Structure 1
């Protein structure tokens, strides 16, 4: 059966895509600085193999770090759609999560999840650099496990069908 080959290759693919996890160079608000702080030496991102890429075509993670305004929501949707699959989305900050300090505003979208599917949320205002690091590492672990979460059932011979 293909599973004999698929499962080890699945593990290798998950390991490779976890090791190389390039987010998009996109910051909107104060949460950008926290992202830069994680990128810089005190909490090196590179240790976990995450390197930022400017073009969405070369990005695996969409770091929605900052407030999203109605004047920008179409742009965020276009960026998400133009990012090559497979991809994940991480909301950072109260403003990106649920509107934050500007939830009662006439210009701010009440949450980036309304425009985009958000894979993970990192609470904070601003989230600490270690908080962002924790969120990214948790996202990486979940990403590695997503390939095979025990969906297929095992038959009498222990081979998934």
Structure 2
């Protein structure tokens, strides 16, 4: 009978976390430049509530937008670990996805998914600001739906147990 309360509060919590998705001000390369372009007037992330916070403690989203090197992989892992829960990960660009242009390099991790778990991938090089906004909006929709995906079954009285 506790499901009567949590499910509306589940919806409220999901709406609150999707309406204040704060990503970490952490960019690396041309992908970071396009990420900055995805914040300014033309494509306003503030419309969906996406405002950048400078510290991982105050950030819900880790936006890995750039090339991850072997000299940086421990840094990215530490940044992911120090981010307060719940947290999601968006890999923007071919370098973050699977290495991209530098996949055959001696000092490239060949994807940030080898270091930290990635929740969503945006493929472009660089992804357009529209592509990044699409990825962010899809991630917000998914994390809104992730609190209750129907895992709990329904008994004879249609209340999840």
User: Same fold per TM (> 0.5)?
Assistant: yes
- Cα drift, residue 59 of structure 1: 0.2
Paired with 1:72 and 1:33, the residues of 2 have a C-alpha distance of: 19
Equivalent in the alignment of 2:65: 65
Alpha-carbon distance in structure 1 between the residues aligned to 2:18 and 2:27: 22
Deviations 1:36-59 (A, max 9, x none): 111000000000001000011000
Q: Structure 2: any 5+ residue segments left out of the alignment?
A: none
How far apart, in 2, do the equivalents of 1:65 and 1:17 lie?
22
Alignment match, 2:42: 42
1:96, distance to aligned residue in structure 2 (A): 0.4
Q: CA deviation at 1:145?
A: 0.1
Following TM superposition, by how much is the alpha carbon of 1:128 offset from its aligned partner in structure 2, in angstroms?
0.4
SS in structure 1 of the partner of residue 6 of structure 2? helix
Structure 1: runs of 5 or more not aligned: none
Aligned to 1:149: 149
Runs of 4+ in 1 over 2 A off after TM superposition: none
Deviation by residue 1:117-158 (Cα, 9 ceiling, x = unmatched): 000000000000000000000000000000000000000000
Q: CA deviation digits over 1:13-67, x for unaligned, max 9?
A: 0000000000000001110111011100000000000100001100000000000
**Partner Cα separation in structure 2 for residue 56 and residue 157 of structure 1:** 43
- 3-state SS of 2:38 partner: helix
Q: Distance in 2 between matches of 1:144 and 1:69?
A: 33
User: Over the residues paired in the alignment, what is the CA RMSD in angstroms?
Assistant: 0.3
TM-score using structure 2 length: 1.00
**Cα deviation 1:1-21 (Å, max 9, x = unaligned):** 100000000000000000000
How far apart in 2 are the matches of 1:129 and 1:37?
6
